[PDB]
């Protein structure tokens, strides 16, 4: 079974910038090779075909080229629309397997987060859990770390985080982290903090409240 | 050239489901049909293909057995049988086609894509959501929003102010916790003075439960 | 001779001359091999489709495609190859009667030597 290792997994570029995408095949898998891109929410798009042929109504600023069991796709000028996956696909033999994908991101200054920390609500409480909600608005990178703490104990295995894609405006993200405790857990401690640590904050920055 | 794709939905572990994608604009005998299925923030993974004019199929070994692609040219028409399904079966899953058929095991790319099904695989049963306000918070730009949780399956839709309200918000992708239930958070950012002057109100629809939900948030 | 084309199938004829080529191509492969397989449909002119097989499969094997038809708008009014690393190996050349009629009886196959 052949497997395409693609990287990178993820990079970082500005609009007008040139971006190489590489792809290794484990095999001779000839040139049955193809790169396609997907935007969330959206099935792929075919961009090049046979390793090195472009596909009708692709823009001319994408080519791919080979060299052995090496693939490489080139976009020689990054276009607002062209920030998405690209996933490599070698369909020589069966099974036909793909890369695990290249998200392109745009790159922009570096923002400190905006943190707020919301308290379970009441009706929540009264069906015998709460949720802790961390949110960390409009920053970048994305690389940001959130460590709850409940009187200061360190909190593990009892948070999930999610994250938005990149805005459409202003081209930063915004991360939640969730804090589950069942009401008893809950009621049992009173100060309940979520620390932040981001490359745009001099310091780790606290948001906390007091139960009640 | 279209694809359309159709029979997705939500099963039982062990359960079964019948996929199946319409073709139209080109003669199924002189394409291969393919099954690409992507799980919740996974890569794309090959399902299965067909070549009609050879009726010969081929699998991902992790189906094997399991599932059963097959065509009617009569009819344009490939169906992927998706029998004695597990939770790792969960994913959007696409139809594609490439042109030409070969007799062995060997296809050109795939230049026509479907929208794509969602198909669940889960014990949970159906639910909507439960809605619990993220009250703005007293030391004050403000925060507020809406927790959507415990709801199965996906998806559900969020808006605001029956969508008078846009700029701002975000809403999260949603989160499989462990109870086997989905939960996600909508928030939106807006200035301190309008708290208590302005009403706030998070639309949440579940279709696959035929529920709505509006809740106002407002401070504690 | 590695690669040695078995036979050709017209597989809509006749047709209407807006209608695609649909074309059955088999052949043989006697070991195996490093570079592709090109093959093209050629109106004697206009290319209507160069298929590309690689890596070559071993033994007796077959594909089918669809060729889209030329365009009138090229041609005046009054008015299929293979190679292997870019050297051309066999070529079978038809004759053609808007109803088309594809005088499919009376291929026209001409072989040439190459280093493989």
Same mark, same amino acid.
């Given at each position: ?20 995408? *590489?792809?290794?095949?484990? %095999? ?22 046979? !390793? ?44 036909? *397997?793909?890369? %695990? ?27 015998? *859990? ?22 200061? !104990?360190? %909190? ?9 894609? %990149? ?46 | ?15 079964? $489901?019948?996929? +199946? ?62 029998? &004695? ?10 139809? /594609?086609?490439?042109?030409?058929? /070969? ?34 918070? +007293?030391?004050?730009?403000?925060? $507020? ?13 969020? &808006? ?15 989160? $499989? ?6 939960? $996600? ?36 | ?116």
């Amino acid at each position: 079974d052949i497997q395409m290792t693609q990287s990178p997994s993820s990079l970082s570029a500005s609009v007008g910038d040139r971006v190489t995408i *590489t792809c290794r095949a484990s %095999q001779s898998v000839s040139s049955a090779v193809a790169w396609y891109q997907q935007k969330p929410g959206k099935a792929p798009k075919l961009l090049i075909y046979s !390793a090195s042929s472009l596909y009708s109504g692709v823009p001319s600023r994408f080519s791919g080229s080979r060299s052995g069991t090496d693939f490489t796709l080139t976009i020689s000028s990054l276009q607002p629309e062209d920030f998405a996956t690209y996933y490599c696909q070698q369909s020589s033999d069966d099974p036909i *397997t793909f890369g %695990q994908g290249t998200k392109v991101e745009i790159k922009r200054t570096v923002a400190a987060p905006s943190v707020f920390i919301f308290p379970p609500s009441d009706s929540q409480l009264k069906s015998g *859990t709460a949720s802790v909600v961390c949110l960390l608005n409009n920053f970048y990178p994305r690389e940001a770390k959130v460590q709850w703490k409940v009187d200061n !104990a360190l %909190q593990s295995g009892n948070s999930q985080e999610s994250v938005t894609e %990149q805005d459409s405006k202003d081209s930063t993200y915004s991360l939640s982290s969730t804090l589950t405790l069942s009401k008893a857990d809950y009621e049992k401690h009173k100060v309940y903090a979520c620390e932040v640590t981001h490359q745009g904050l001099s310091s780790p920055v606290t948001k906390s409240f007091n139960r009640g | 050239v279209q694809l359309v794709e159709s029979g997705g939905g939500l099963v039982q572990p062990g359960g079964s $489901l019948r996929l +199946s994608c319409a073709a139209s604009g080109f003669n199924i005998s002189y394409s291969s049909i393919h099954w690409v299925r992507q799980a919740p923030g996974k890569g794309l993974e090959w399902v299965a293909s067909i070549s009609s004019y050879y009726g010969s199929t081929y699998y991902a070994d992790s189906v094997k057995g399991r599932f059963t692609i097959s065509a009617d040219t009569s009819k344009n028409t490939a169906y992927l049988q998706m029998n &004695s399904l597990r939770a790792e079966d969960t994913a959007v899953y696409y139809c /594609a086609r490439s042109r030409g058929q /070969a007799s062995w095991d060997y296809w050109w790319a795939m230049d026509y894509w479907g929208q794509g099904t969602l198909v669940t695989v889960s014990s949970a049963s159906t639910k909507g959501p439960s809605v619990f306000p993220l009250a703005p918070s +007293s030391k004050s730009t403000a925060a $507020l929003g809406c927790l959507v949780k415990d709801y199965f399956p996906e998806p559900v839709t969020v &808006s605001w102010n029956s969508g008078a309200l846009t700029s701002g918000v975000h809403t999260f992708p949603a989160v $499989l916790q462990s109870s086997g239930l989905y939960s $996600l958070s909508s928030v939106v950012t807006v200035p301190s003075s309008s708290l208590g002057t302005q009403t706030y109100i998070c639309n949440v629809n579940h279709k696959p439960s035929n529920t709505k939900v509006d809740k106002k948030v407002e401070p504690k | 001779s590695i690669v040695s084309l078995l036979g050709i199938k017209v597989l809509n004829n006749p047709a209407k001359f807006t209608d695609p080529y649909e074309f059955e191509i088999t052949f043989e492969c006697l070991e195996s091999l490093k570079h592709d397989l090109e093959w093209k449909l050629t109106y004697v002119d206009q290319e209507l489709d160069s298929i590309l097989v690689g890596p070559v499969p071993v033994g007796v094997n077959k594909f089918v495609f669809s060729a889209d038809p030329p365009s009138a708008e090229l041609i005046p009014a009054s008015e299929l190859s293979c190679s292997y690393d870019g050297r051309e190996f066999v070529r079978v050349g038809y004759y053609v009667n808007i109803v088309r009629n594809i005088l499919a009886e009376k291929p026209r196959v001409t072989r040439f030597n190459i280093v493989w």
